[PDB]
Amino acid sequence: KLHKEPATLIKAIDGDTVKLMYKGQPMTFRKLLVDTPEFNEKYGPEASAFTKKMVENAKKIEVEFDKGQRTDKYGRGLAYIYADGKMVNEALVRQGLAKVAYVYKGNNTHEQLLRKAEAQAKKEKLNIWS
């Protein structure tokens, strides 16, 4: 069972990385099970803009850790990010602005949900999939 925890946006970084105040401290988060293009590749700025809008325009941001390792080696929180109850990781993939990433260290709870969204984006030849 996973639980959502409040966070506050500090700064949108790129498609799949964002900085938030979490449990009183600023922390950089990496979105679980997604890979957005780096800003200097195709759909990079598109993925960055999408995430940025979602997190800035949200009234409530939440972070949901999975059951695996909670930080990568670069110190980034590994989480599912929600803006107003809506999962940003999922939205990226469904919009075809991110691919589903390999499972990292037991963090697989929403893998099927995301592969589902990705198959549909691909079926629609949407963005990355055009």
What's phi and psi for 127, nearest 5 deg? 50, -110
Helices (H), 37-126: 44-57, 88-94, 111-123
Please answer whether residues 114 and 93 qualify as being in contact, where contact means their C-beta atoms are separated by less than 8 angstroms. yes
Tell me the two tokens of residue 88.
């940003």
Is beta strand 61-65 parallel, antiparallel or unpaired with respect to 25-31?
unpaired
d(C-alpha 26, C-alpha 41), whole Å: 28
DSSP 57: H
Instruction: Return the SS3 of 96.
Output: coil
**Residue range 1-130, CATH number:** 2.40.50.90
d(C-alpha 16, C-alpha 120), whole Å: 20
Phi-psi label, residue 96: left if phi above 0, alpha if psi -120 to 50, beta otherwise: left
Tell me the two tokens of residue 115.
């592969």
Resolution for this PDB entry, in angstroms: 1.9
What's phi and psi for 52, nearest 5 deg? -55, -50
d(C-alpha 107, C-alpha 36), whole Å: 18
Active site residues: 30, 38, 76
Tell me the two tokens of residue 105.
């260290």
Question: Known binder of ligand: residue 16?
Answer: yes
| Determination technique used | X-ray
Question: Known binder of ligand: residue 35?
Answer: yes
Contacts of 96 (CB under 8 A, 6+ apart): 121, 122, 124, 126, 127, 128, 129, 130
Question: Known binder of ligand: residue 72?
Answer: no
Please answer whether residues 75 and 56 qualify as being in contact, where contact means their C-beta atoms are separated by less than 8 angstroms. no
Tell me the two tokens of residue 54.
């979602």
d(C-alpha 122, C-alpha 93), whole Å: 10
Is beta strand 77-83 parallel, antiparallel or unpaired with respect to 25-31?
parallel
DSSP 114: H
Distances (CA, A) of 5 to 26, 60, 115, 125: 14, 10, 24, 34
